[model samples]
Target: GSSGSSGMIAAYENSKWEPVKWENDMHCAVKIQDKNQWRRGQIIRMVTDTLVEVLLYDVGVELVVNVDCLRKLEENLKTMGRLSL
Candidate 1:
């Protein structure tokens, strides 16, 4: 079993916290601007040069967000279990 808090702290410490070059199937941390929070997500599609579709793994929600809002996922966090089906 994975500890969510542990994974989150690891992500915060190890991630660059900066936008990454988008690639298909890349795991990422998404900044929810409205909530000012971070969520685990995976790149599922590229809608445009600046917009990408991401699956919020924990919430099972799909969002199309600006590429600038994405951050590189930490390696350890990537191994955390996903909640989405």
Candidate 2:
């Protein structure tokens, strides 16, 4: 069986958020609107398209983001293990 490396997440966003662009290794969060932000964290829950969540242990706060936001974070995680928004 020769299959490609499976993708990490299964949800999709409408390409609404901007591409991932953050500072050096230490920072890894991306913001779209004035407030909507997504960062690196273990997926705590996947309740719904709008409820998919990530737990930010660094700040001890839980964040809910779209699947697209998560996809962007997952992609960013490839280079930066942890990030913020």
Best by TM-score: 1
Candidate 2 wrong stretches, greater than 4 Å: 1-32, 35-38, 72-85
TM-score of each: 0.65, 0.39
lDDT of 1 by residue, 1-85 (tens): 8734666645564555464578898887777776757787889999998888999987988878877767777665555676453
Note the Cα lDDT for every prediction shown: 0.74, 0.46
RMSD (Cα, Å) of candidate 2? Answer: 13.4
TM-score of 1: 0.65
User: Each candidate: how many clashes?
Assistant: 0, 2
> What RMSD does model 1 have?
5.6
Best by lDDT: 1
| Clashing residue pairs found in predicted model 1 | none
